[PDB]
């Protein structure tokens, strides 16, 4: 059979080729995860077709209906065989799907407009002149919320009662708010995205300080999948071959603009 | 049955307590992995006994006999139920034992004696005045060896023919050679170890440059062990609870001397 690989339109992981209107199948797409799926399928010896997730979501369980959305849903309800995407390895997800060992590391990070006098979380917490927020619904907001940790507890208090709202509907909106804030807004988001935006014109943003946590993205397969073991080993092999670092350099820095 | 947990005397993961003659069993030991084993056993709901690996090795396969030594061997041949140690997740190992998702990240890093005019790998590669090397057997050496990569190829060519040998028998030997070589030797090693030593008297070493690769330590179990699933979910929960970061800070920085 041709294996179905669910993925997500997130730059630079999966993006449309310029004339994608004119193209067919896997040829429609390019990016880090396009390259990754290609290399994995080579080592696992499978034919495959990329499938863009229909709701544009990674995967969360609705607190009410208990239905999984996004790519996680595609795996659990049997539409996709594997997810190759920047899907974060988390406890609730690992309970319902299997992940490979991480193909990329990351953590919560601070994005500022260049020139903003901020160099760390501690810098943000003590002051109020510069506003800061996060995505309104993800895992970054949860880190601060479910964080029994000093300075981050102070940050959460501020964010939860801030006026108006410092939580953004999308990651992209957060980024735009930093850019248009004249230095009065900072945004917390995945380090990999922060690093990516720092490489986009007009080069007006910067990542500052260390990461506040540590996580990995993994390739996902359903429980009991015949592919699980061949996918895990392929990811380890690619790391040791230097491919994964080569792909990150390619899409972040060789193709960067700053 | 009481679970056998194999581990290794490596500071600050597992170390003897002050008057250890006077103590018995698990009470003899303290450290990052002592604390980690206690937390994992708590979530997995098992009674356990720490056992220091007899040969004091992590684990490698003899190229002639094909027999595994170290903690890897203890798992593979049936003498230990879990290894709770800074055991590097690698393809050849994952082929024979199971690993949790990483509890700690790391990469190849450069250790210098303070004062040495080296800030990066590129700095080492373009000169010969200041000698540099790695452990004579492990993944740091193999990174360079099997690295079809520009500056690293140049570094491998140098180290391969350096006279006398720049490869050390032990990591501790490499660290001593940095300290005693009056600014003429730099050592390449695990970033976590580099960072730890930087925090120890007499505070004469420094970690410089970014990491050359990316890897993780994992908690290991025998292939197909019934304990694998819960150990992995335990590590993920501990990370999400912030407790892995708390342990790192405790053993590296709160207990630091520099
Ligand atoms: N890149 C990236 C991202 C990858 C993500 C993400 C958000 C972002 N992001 O927008 O920064 N949320 C997730 O729940 C996830 O599994 N993976
Ligand atoms: N710390 C530590 C270390 C942890 C290690 C190691 C060397 C060191 N070291 O001496 O730096 N070699 C390994 O093969 C391993 O699985 N784990
Ligand atoms: Zn279109
Ligand atoms: Zn390949």
UniProtKB/Swiss-Prot annotation, chains A, B:
Disulfide feature: 203-258
Residue numbers binding L-glutamate: 86, 88, 93, 139-140, 190
Compartments reported by the entry: Cell membrane; Postsynaptic cell membrane; Postsynaptic density membrane
Extracellular side: 117-258
Superkingdom in the source lineage: Eukaryota
Subunit comment: Homotetramer or heterotetramer of pore-forming glutamate receptor subunits. Tetramers may be formed by the dimerization of dimers. Interacts with PICK1, GRIP1 and GRIP2. Found in a complex with GRIA1, GRIA2, GRIA4, CNIH2, CNIH3, CACNG2, CACNG3, CACNG4, CACNG5, CACNG7 and CACNG8. Interacts with CACNG5. Found in a complex with GRIA1, GRIA2, GRIA4, DLG4, CACNG8 and CNIH2.
Protein family (similarity comment): Belongs to the glutamate-gated ion channel (TC 1.A.10.1) family. GRIA3 subfamily.
Additional facts recorded: The postsynaptic actions of Glu are mediated by a variety of receptors that are named according to their selective agonists. This receptor binds AMPA (quisqualate) > glutamate > kainate.
Function noted in UniProt: Ionotropic glutamate receptor that functions as a ligand-gated cation channel, gated by L-glutamate and glutamatergic agonists such as alpha-amino-3-hydroxy-5-methyl-4-isoxazolepropionic acid (AMPA), quisqualic acid, and kainic acid. L-glutamate acts as an excitatory neurotransmitter at many synapses in the central nervous system and plays an important role in fast excitatory synaptic transmission by inducing long-term potentiation.
Protein name per UniProt: Glutamate receptor 3
Organism: Rattus norvegicus
Gene encoding the protein: Gria3
Interval of the full protein contained in this chain: 417 to 799 of 888
């Amino acid at each position: 059979r041709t294996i179905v690989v669910t993925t997500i339109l997130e730059s630079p992981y999966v993006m449309y080729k310029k004339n994608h209107e004119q193209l067919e199948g896997n040829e429609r797409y390019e990016g880090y995860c396009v390259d990754l799926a290609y290399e994995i399928a080579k080592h696992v010896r499978i034919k495959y077709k990329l499938s863009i997730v229909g709701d544009g979501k990674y995967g969360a369980r609705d607190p009410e209906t208990k239905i999984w959305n996004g790519m996680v849903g595609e795996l659990v309800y049997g539409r996709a065989d594997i997810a190759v995407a920047p899907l974060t390895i988390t406890l609730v997800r690992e309970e319902v799907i299997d992940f490979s060992k991480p193909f990329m590391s990351l953590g919560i990070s601070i994005m500022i407009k260049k020139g903003t006098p901020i160099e760390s979380a501690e810098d943000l917490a003590k002051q109020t002149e510069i506003a800061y927020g996060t995505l309104d619904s993800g895992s970054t907001k949860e880190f601060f919320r479910r964080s029994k940790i000093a300075v981050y507890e102070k940050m959460w208090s501020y964010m939860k009662s801030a006026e108006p709202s410092v939580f953004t509907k999308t990651t992209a909106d957060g980024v735009a708010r930093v850019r248009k804030s004249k230095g009065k807004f900072a945004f917390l988001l995945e380090s990999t995205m922060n690093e990516y935006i720092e490489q986009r014109k007009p080069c007006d943003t910067m990542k500052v300080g260390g990461n506040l946590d540590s996580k990995g993205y993994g390739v996902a397969t359903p429980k009991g999948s015949a592919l699980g073991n061949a996918v895990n080993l392929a990811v380890l092999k690619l790391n040791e071959q230097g491919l994964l670092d080569k792909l990150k350099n390619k899409w972040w820095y060789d193709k960067g603009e700053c």
